[PDB]
Short mmCIF file of C-alpha atoms and ligand atoms in Angstrom, two decimals:
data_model
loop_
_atom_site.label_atom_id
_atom_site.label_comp_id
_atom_site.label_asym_id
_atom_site.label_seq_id
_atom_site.Cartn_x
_atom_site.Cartn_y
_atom_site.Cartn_z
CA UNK A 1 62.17 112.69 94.14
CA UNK A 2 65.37 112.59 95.74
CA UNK A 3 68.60 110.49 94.43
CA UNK A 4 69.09 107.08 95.27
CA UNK A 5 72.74 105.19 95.26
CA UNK A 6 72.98 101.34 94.84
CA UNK A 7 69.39 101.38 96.25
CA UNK A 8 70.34 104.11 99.28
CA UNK A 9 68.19 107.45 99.20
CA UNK A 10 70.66 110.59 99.75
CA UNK A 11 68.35 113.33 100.95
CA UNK A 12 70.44 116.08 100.46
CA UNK A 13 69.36 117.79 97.88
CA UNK A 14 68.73 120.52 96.87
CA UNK A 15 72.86 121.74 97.91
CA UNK A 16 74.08 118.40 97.05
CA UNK A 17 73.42 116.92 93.86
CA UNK A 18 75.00 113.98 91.31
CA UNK A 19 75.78 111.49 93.91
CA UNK A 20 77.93 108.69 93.00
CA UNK A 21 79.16 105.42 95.09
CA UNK A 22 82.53 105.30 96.68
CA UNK A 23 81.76 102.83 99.25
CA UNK A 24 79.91 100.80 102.49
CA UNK A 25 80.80 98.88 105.50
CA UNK A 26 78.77 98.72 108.57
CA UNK A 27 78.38 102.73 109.09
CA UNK A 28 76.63 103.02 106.51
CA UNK A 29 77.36 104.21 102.55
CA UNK A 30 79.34 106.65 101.57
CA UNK A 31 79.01 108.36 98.03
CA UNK A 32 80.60 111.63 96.18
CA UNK A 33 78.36 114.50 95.76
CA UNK A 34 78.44 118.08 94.28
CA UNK A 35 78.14 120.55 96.32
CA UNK A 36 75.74 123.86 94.67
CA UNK A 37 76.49 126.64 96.98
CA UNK A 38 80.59 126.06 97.34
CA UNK A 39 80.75 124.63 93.75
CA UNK A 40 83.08 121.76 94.92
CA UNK A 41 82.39 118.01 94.87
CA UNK A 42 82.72 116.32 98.67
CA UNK A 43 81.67 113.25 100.10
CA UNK A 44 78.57 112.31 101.84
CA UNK A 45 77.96 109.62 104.07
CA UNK A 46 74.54 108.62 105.09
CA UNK A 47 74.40 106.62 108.78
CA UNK A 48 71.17 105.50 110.34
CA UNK A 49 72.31 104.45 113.35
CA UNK A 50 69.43 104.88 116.15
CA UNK A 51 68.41 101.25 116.47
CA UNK A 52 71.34 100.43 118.40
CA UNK A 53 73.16 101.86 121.41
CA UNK A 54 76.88 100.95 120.52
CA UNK A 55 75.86 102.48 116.58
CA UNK A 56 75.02 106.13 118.49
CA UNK A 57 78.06 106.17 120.95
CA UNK A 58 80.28 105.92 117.67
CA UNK A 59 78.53 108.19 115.33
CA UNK A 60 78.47 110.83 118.84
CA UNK A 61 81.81 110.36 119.00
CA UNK A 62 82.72 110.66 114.93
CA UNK A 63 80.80 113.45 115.13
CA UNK A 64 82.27 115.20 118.16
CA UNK A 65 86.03 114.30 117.58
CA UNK A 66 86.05 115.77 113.91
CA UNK A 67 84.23 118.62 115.03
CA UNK A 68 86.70 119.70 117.75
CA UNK A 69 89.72 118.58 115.98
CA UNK A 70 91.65 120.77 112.99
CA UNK A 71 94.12 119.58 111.00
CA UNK A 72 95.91 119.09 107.89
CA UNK A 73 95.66 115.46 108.11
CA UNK A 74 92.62 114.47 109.31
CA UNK A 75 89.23 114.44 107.70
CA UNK A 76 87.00 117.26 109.07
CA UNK A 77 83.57 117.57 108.96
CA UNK A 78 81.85 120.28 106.94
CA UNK A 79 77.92 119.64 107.04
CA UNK A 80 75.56 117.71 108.62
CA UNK A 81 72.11 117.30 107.51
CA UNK A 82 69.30 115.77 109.22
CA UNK A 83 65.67 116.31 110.04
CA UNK A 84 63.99 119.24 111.68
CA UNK A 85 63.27 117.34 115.01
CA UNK A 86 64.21 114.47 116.71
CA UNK A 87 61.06 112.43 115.97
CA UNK A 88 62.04 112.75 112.56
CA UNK A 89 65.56 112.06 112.19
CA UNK A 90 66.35 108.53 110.90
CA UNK A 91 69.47 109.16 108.95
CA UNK A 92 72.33 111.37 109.55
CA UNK A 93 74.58 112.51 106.24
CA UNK A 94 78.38 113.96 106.82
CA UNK A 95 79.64 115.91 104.35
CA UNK A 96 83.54 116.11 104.16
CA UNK A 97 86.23 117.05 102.09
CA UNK A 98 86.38 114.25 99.01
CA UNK A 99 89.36 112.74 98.70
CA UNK A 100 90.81 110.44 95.50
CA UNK A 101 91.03 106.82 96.98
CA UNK A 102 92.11 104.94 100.52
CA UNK A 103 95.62 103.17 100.97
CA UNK A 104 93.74 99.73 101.28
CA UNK A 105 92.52 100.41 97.48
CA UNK A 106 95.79 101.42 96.74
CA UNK A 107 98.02 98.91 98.01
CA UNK A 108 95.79 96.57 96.02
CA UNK A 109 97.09 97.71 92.44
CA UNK A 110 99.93 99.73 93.34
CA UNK A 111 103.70 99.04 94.50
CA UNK A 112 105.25 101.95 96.26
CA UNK A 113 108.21 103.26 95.77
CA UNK A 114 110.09 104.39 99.24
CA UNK A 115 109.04 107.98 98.37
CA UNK A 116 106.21 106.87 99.23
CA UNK A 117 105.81 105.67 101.82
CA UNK A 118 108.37 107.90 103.55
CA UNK A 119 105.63 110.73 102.35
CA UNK A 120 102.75 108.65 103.51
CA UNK A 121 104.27 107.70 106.91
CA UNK A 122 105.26 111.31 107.74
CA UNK A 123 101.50 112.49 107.30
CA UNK A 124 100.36 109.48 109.34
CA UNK A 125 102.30 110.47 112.21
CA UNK A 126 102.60 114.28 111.91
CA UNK A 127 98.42 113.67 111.94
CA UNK A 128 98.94 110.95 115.11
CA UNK A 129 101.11 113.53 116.79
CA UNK A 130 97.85 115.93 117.06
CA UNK A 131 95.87 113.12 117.91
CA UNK A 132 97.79 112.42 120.83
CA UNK A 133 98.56 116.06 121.95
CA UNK A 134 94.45 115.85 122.12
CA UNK A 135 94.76 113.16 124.99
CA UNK A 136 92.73 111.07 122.45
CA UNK A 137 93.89 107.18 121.10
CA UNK A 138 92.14 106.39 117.75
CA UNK A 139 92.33 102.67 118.55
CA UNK A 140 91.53 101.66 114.75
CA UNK A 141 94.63 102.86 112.41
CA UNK A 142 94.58 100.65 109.33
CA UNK A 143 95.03 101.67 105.71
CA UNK A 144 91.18 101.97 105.17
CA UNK A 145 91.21 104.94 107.58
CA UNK A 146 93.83 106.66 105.59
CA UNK A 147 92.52 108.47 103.07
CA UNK A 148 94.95 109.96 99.70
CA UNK A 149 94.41 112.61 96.58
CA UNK A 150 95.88 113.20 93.79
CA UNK A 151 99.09 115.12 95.03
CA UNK A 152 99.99 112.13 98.01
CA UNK A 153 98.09 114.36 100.67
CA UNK A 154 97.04 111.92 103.09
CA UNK A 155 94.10 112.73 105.97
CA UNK A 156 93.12 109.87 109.12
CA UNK A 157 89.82 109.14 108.91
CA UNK A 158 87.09 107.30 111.36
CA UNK A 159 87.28 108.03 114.84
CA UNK A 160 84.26 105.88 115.85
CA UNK A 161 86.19 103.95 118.61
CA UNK A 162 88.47 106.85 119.52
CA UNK A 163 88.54 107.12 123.43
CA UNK A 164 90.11 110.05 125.84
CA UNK A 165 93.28 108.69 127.45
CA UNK A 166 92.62 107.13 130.73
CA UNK A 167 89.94 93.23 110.90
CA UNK A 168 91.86 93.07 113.88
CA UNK A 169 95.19 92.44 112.23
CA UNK A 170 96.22 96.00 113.14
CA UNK A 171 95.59 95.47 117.04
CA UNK A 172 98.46 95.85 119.61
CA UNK A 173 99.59 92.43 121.75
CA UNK A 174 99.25 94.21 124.92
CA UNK A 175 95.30 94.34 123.78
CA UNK A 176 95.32 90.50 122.45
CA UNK A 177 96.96 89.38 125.94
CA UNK A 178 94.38 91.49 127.80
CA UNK A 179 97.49 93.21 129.62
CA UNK A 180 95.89 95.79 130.78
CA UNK A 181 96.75 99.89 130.66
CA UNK A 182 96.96 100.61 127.66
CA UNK A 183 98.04 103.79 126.44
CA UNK A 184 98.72 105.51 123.12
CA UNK A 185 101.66 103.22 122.17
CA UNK A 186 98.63 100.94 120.69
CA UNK A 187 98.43 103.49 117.92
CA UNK A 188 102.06 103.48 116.89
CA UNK A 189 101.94 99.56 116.95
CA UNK A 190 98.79 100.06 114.34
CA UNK A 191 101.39 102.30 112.32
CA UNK A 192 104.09 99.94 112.45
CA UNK A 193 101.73 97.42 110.74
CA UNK A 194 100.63 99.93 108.20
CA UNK A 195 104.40 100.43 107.56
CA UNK A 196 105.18 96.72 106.95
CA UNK A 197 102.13 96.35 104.14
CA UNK A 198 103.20 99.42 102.39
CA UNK A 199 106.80 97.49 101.99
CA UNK A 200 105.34 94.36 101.07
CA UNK A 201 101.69 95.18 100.06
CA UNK A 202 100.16 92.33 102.72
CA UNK A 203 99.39 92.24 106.30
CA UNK A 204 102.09 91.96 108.47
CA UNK A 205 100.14 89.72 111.25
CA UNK A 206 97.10 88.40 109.65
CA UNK A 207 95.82 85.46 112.11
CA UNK A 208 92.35 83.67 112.40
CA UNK A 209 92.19 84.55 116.07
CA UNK A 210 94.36 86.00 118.75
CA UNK A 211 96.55 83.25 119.58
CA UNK A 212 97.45 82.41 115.96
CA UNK A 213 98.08 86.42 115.73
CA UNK A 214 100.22 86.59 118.83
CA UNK A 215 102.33 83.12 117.44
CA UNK A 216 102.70 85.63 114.35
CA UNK A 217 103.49 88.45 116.31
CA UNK A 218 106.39 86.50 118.65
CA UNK A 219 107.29 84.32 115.37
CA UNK A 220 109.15 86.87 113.81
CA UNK A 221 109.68 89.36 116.70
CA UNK A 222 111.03 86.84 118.78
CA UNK A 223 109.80 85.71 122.58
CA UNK A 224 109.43 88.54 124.94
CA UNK A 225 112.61 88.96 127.00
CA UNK A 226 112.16 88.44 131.38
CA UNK A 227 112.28 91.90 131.64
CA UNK A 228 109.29 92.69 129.44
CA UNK A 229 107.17 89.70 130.59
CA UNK A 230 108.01 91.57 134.26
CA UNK A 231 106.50 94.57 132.75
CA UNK A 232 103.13 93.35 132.53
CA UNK A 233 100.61 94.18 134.96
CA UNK A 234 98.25 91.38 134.18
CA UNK A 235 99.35 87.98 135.47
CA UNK A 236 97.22 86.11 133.10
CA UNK A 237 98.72 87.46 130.23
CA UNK A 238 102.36 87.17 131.85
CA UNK A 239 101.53 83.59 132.65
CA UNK A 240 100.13 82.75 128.56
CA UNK A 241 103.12 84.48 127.54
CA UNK A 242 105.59 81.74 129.63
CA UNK A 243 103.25 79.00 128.42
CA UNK A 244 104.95 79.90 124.76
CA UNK A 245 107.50 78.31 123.32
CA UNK A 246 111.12 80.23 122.85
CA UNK A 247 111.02 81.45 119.39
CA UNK A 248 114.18 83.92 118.16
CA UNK A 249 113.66 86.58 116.14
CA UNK A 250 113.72 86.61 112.30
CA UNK A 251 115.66 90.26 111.20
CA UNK A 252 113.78 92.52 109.87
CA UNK A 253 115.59 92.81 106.54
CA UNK A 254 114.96 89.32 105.77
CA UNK A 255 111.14 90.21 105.09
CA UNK A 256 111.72 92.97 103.85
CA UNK A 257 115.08 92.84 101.80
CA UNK A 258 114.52 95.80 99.49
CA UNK A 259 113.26 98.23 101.88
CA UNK A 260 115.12 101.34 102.98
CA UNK A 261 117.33 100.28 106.13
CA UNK A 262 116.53 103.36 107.77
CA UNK A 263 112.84 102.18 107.57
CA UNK A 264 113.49 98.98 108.81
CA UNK A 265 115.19 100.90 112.07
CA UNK A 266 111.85 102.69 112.59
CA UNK A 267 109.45 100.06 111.95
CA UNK A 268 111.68 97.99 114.44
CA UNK A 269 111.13 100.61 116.99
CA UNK A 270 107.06 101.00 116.19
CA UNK A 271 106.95 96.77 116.14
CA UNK A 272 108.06 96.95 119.84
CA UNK A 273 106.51 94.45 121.89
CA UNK A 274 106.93 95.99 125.51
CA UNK A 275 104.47 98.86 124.69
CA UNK A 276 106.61 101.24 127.86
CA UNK A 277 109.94 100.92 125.22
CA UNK A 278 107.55 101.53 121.61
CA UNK A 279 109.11 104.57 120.62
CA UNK A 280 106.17 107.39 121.12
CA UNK A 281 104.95 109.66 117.87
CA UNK A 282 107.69 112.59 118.57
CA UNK A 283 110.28 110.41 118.83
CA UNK A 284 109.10 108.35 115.72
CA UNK A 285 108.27 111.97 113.48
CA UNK A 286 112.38 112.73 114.31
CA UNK A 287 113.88 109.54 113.17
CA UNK A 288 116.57 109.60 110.63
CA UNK A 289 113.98 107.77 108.08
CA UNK A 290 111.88 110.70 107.79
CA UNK A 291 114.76 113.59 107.93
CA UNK A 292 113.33 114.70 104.37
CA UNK A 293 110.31 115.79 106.12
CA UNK A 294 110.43 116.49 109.87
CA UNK A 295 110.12 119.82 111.03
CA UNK A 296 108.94 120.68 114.65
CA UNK A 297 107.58 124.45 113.66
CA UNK A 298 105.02 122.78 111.15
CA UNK A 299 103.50 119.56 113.02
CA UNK A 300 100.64 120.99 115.52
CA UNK A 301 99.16 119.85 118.48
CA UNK A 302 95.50 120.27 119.92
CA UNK A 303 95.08 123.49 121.04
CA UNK A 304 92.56 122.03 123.97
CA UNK A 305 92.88 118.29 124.65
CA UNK A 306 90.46 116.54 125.50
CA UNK A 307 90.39 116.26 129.68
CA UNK A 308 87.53 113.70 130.19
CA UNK A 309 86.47 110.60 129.65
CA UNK A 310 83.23 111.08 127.05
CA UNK A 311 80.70 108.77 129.14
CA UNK A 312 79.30 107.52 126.73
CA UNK A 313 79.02 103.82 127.46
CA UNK A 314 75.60 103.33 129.87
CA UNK A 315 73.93 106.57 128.42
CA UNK A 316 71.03 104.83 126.31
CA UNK A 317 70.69 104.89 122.89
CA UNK A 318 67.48 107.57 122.82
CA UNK A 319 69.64 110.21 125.00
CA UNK A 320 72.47 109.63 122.80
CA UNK A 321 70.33 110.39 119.95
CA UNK A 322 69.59 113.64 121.59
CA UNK A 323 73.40 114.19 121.96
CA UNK A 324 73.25 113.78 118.41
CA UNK A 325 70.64 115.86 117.63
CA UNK A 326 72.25 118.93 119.69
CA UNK A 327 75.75 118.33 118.48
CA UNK A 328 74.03 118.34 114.30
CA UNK A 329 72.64 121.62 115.36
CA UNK A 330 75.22 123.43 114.67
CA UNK A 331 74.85 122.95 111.13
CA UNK A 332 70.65 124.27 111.43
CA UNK A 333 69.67 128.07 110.38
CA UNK A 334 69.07 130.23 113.36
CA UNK A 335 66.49 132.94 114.07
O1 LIG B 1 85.10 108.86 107.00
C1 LIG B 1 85.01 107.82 106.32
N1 LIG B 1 85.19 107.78 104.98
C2 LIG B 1 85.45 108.84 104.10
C3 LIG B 1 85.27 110.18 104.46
C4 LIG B 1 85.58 111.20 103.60
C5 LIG B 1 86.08 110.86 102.34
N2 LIG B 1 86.44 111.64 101.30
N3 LIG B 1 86.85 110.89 100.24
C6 LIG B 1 86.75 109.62 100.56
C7 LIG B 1 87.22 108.54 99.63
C8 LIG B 1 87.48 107.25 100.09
C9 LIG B 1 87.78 106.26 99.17
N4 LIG B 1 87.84 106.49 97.85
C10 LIG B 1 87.58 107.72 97.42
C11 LIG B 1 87.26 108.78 98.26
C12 LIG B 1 86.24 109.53 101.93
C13 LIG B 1 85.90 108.50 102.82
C14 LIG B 1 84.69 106.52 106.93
C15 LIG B 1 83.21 106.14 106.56
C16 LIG B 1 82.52 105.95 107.90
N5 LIG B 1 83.33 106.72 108.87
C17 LIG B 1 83.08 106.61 110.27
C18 LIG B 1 81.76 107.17 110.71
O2 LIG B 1 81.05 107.77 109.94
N6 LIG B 1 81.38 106.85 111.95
C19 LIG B 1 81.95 105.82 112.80
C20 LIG B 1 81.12 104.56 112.68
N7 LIG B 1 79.70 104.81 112.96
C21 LIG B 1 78.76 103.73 112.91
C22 LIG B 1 79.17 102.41 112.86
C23 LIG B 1 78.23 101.39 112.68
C24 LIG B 1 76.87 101.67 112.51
C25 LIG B 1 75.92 100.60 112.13
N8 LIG B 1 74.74 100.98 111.59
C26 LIG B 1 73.96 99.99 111.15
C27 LIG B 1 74.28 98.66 111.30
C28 LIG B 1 75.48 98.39 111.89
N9 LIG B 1 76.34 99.34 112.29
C29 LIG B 1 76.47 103.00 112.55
C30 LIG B 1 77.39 104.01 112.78
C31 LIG B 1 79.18 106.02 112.32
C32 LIG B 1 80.06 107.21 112.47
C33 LIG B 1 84.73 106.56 108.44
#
């Protein structure tokens, strides 16, 4: 019989072998495994999405994205197993490299020092940089998506809600106010978050919903300025935004009073609220913060971004199975 994980059957055998739980969330479960032709241990991740439409447009896209995309720091994808036909094919396991933990599990027991996260934030956006140069938004940066080993190498994982350019405690304000056009700045925002709960190890702008999120937000950043409530496209939004109450903002190195000041410059520039003045990834990979680091000749971009919108959203959930199906092939025998 085949192994079983925390009551989960991994059918993967006989390559993989001595599977072991790292973790689950709504995707699915995702274990460690050894691998018996390449004599390495990976991880495995077994999704059974087909029941639902939204569950197939995100493992398509997962699937797609890591496919096309090759880079230092972001996961790839190097199997897929699933059934011999369509009929058959229930669950879908993605073998990638394994890495050593997550930043969430890590800012749980660990303080870091500002090597650190200097190291960590560098990787982040040296991997955002190709990201964007792909004409792709990832839309769901948080530390559970960024993956570490032993060394400090860090990779982005999860792009289930990635889209082509056109918790919820990482989300930009344009996107709580409904603004409208949003762009890739929404990612940097996400970073700027991640940057603030590596200083402090706690979420920046935790909030039950997303008014209490947005009072968070303009607490401590201060009340939009004319100019930048003029900037948005959306009158509704504009309109909530005047409804609020004139709050100043709180400086930056009183929350964080031990952190690098050169940090605090960046993060000030990622925690923009006017999403057109957010200082945009090549911009951010050049500030003085990350000097140690930056260099131009070694941070790549997508050698063929993405043109296209993926139209995925009103294809139903059997035809994106098929898409599925055809895009796993790859990973089949031929004649
Ligand atoms: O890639 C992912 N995780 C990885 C990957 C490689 C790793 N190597 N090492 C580790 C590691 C982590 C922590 N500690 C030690 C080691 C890895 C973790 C995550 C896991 C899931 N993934 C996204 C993904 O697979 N897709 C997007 C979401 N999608 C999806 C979402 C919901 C449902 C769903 N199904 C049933 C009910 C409800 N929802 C189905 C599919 C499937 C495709 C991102």
């Amino acid at each position: 019989g085949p192994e079983m994980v925390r009551g989960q059957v991994f059918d993967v055998g006989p390559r993989y072998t001595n599977l072991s739980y790292i973790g689950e969330g709504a995707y699915g479960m995702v274990c460690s495994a050894y691998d018996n032709v390449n004599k390495v241990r990976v991880a495995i991740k077994k999704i059974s999405p087909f029941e639902h439409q939204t569950y197939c447009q995100r493992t398509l896209r997962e699937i797609k994205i890591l496919l096309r995309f090759r880079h230092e720091n972001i996961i790839g994808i190097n199997d897929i197993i699933r059934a011999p036909t369509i009929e058959q094919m229930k669950d879908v396991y993605i073998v990638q490299d394994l890495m050593e933990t997550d930043l969430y599990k890590l800012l749980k027991t660990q303080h870091l020092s500002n090597d650190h996260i200097c190291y960590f934030l560098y990787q982040i956006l040296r991997g955002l940089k190709y990201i964007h140069s792909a004409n792709v938004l990832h839309r769901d940066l948080k530390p559970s998506n960024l993956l570490l080993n032993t060394t400090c190498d860090l990779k982005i994982c999860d792009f289930g809600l990635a889209r082509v350019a056109d918790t919820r405690w990482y989300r930009a304000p344009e996107i709580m106010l409904n603004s409208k056009g949003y762009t890739k700045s929404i990612d940097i925002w996400s970073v700027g978050c991640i940057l603030a709960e590596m200083l402090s190890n706690r979420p920046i702008f935790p909030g039950k919903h997303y008014l209490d999120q947005l009072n968070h937000i303009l607490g401590i950043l201060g009340s939009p300025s004319q100019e930048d409530l003029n900037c948005i496209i959306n009158l509704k939004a504009r309109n909530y935004l005047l409804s609020l109450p004139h709050k100043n903002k709180v400086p930056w190195n009183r929350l964080f009073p031990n952190a690098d000041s050169k940090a605090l410059d960046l993060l000030d520039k990622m925690l923009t609220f006017n999403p057109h003045k957010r200082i945009e990834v090549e911009q951010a990979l050049a500030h003085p913060y990350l000097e140690q680091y930056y260099d131009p000749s070694d941070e790549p971009i997508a050698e063929a971004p993405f043109k296209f919108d993926m139209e995925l959203d009103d294809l139903p959930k059997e035809k994106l199975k098929e898409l599925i199906f055809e895009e796993t092939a790859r990973f089949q025998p031929g004649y």
